[PDB]
Amino acid sequence: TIASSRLRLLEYSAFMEVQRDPDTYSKHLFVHIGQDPPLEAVDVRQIYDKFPEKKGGLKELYEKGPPNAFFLVKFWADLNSTIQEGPGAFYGVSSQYSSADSMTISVSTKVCSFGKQVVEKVETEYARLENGRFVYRIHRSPMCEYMINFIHKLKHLPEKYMMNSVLENFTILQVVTSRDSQETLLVIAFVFEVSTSEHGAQHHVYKLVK
Ligand SMILES: O=C(O)c1cnc2c(cnn2C2CCCC2)c1
């Protein structure tokens, strides 16, 4: 469970959806996190090299704190072409959060490639009271053309070891802050590999410590 003292990640999924006919849709999940067990710890200094981006970077954010907001998710992305991709295929990202307190949050998603920030998405979300808790939803946020082209380039590689060498240099840094106070609520560093398993995409969550 990815949760700080102020915010919990309920769900996260990167996917592509193709419309076979007006009433039929197929959805392929590249990565997914759904739905508390104790988490294994990873020293944050072991991944500073993987996130070398200076301003809005990991080292600076960790020093600002609180340390309880920092998590690392290692993904094994399912890049198998299970669904037949056609012309109007939608590539998107959906995520949900919850908190005990009502807040306006700001979700910044930094996509990095070769140690350089390539895309940054900033989305403001308002609290919705739901079953005594406050929920935040980012539904079907479209992937930018950079990310759709990166996935095609990855799928067109003749070997899964070649895709791992590319994914070695690809990271995503998600920073959720309170909109008005600018306080760090949740930080998730994402690192990637290609899934070799028949059980599809897999992930491992770690608590970042110092
Ligand atoms: O927020 C985004 O735009 C975004 C773009 N691409 C993403 C994710 C999560 N996984 N992936 C790809 C890595 C390789 C498989 C799919 C999120």
UniProtKB/Swiss-Prot annotation:
Compartments reported by the entry: Nucleus
Location of the region described as Transcriptional activation in the Swiss-Prot/TrEMBL record: 1-210
Domain of life: Eukaryota
Tissue: Preferentially expressed in the placenta.
Protein function: Transcription factor which plays a key role in the Hippo signaling pathway, a pathway involved in organ size control and tumor suppression by restricting proliferation and promoting apoptosis. The core of this pathway is composed of a kinase cascade wherein MST1/MST2, in complex with its regulatory protein SAV1, phosphorylates and activates LATS1/2 in complex with its regulatory protein MOB1, which in turn phosphorylates and inactivates YAP1 oncoprotein and WWTR1/TAZ.
Oligomer status and interactors: Interacts with YAP1 and WWTR1/TAZ.
Protein name in UniProt: Transcriptional enhancer factor TEF-5
Span covered, complete protein: 219 to 434 of 435
